């Protein structure tokens, strides 16, 4: 419920030309949430908004490289 | 500003030469490289 | 005694101008330099598809 999704909205935590942290935060936020909702089980569609936002905003090569590194055990972000 | 007359006058003929030589020293070697540009390309 | 410019000024001004105008105009219009002027009021468009 509430998605109705077109593209990521304006987000006053990231108000400037530089949008790097926005992609990054959302990647983090997506995966933290996924963590929580799996060391409990069931649905992750609570986290789904985060997936949609960073999907829209991160370049693919960034997302895949990060994805690799999570699997690799070399991802430098606290999840 | 004032000056003595030339110690060693450079006549019109002499100027003509000085001038012609100066130009050629600039033009020839570049004209050369430029003219052969093509003999350098496709490699 | 009249100076270099009293004697030659008028010849130098005259041939200088002449030689200059001639050769530029020659150069501008006669050796195939492409200027690519605005086609407007110059070129008749043609079907490209």
């Amino acid at each position: 419920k509430i998605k109705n999704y077109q593209t990521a909205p304006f987000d006053s935590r990231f108000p400037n030309q530089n949008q790097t942290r926005n992609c990054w935060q959302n990647y983090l936020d997506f995966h933290r949430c996924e963590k929580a909702m799996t060391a409990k089980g069931g649905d992750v569609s609570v986290c789904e908004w985060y997936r949609r936002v960073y999907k829209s905003l991160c370049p693919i090569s960034w997302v895949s490289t990060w994805d690799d590194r999570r699997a690799e055990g070399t991802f430098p972000g606290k999840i | 500003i004032t000056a003595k007359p030339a110690k060693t006058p450079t006549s019109p003929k002499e100027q003509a030469i000085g001038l012609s030589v100066t130009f050629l020293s600039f033009l020839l070697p570049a004209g050369w490289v430029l003219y052969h540009l093509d003999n350098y390309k496709k490699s | 005694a009249p100076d270099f410019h009293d004697k030659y000024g008028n010849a130098v001004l005259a041939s200088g101008a002449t030689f200059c105008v001639a050769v530029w105009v020659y150069m501008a219009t006669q050796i195939g330099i492409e200027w690519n002027p605005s086609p407007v009021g110059r070129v008749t468009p043609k079907e490209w598809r």
Binding site: - | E14, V21, T22, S25, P29, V33, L34, L37, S43 | -
Partner: protein, 46 residues
């Protein structure tokens, strides 16, 4: 005690105008020429 006066405070001679001419012409000419020859040099590295 160095030489002082016009034509004496420069590291080159102006005693002969024709020698002066050859000198200047090598000097300025070498400078102008070089980028033409560097470009050449680079095209022939190929």
């Amino acid at each position: 005690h160095y030489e002082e006066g016009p034509g004496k405070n420069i590291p080159f001679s102006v005693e002969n105008k024709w020698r002066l001419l050859a000198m200047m012409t090598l000097f300025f000419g070498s400078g102008f020429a070089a980028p033409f020859f560097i470009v050449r040099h680079q095209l022939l590295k190929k």
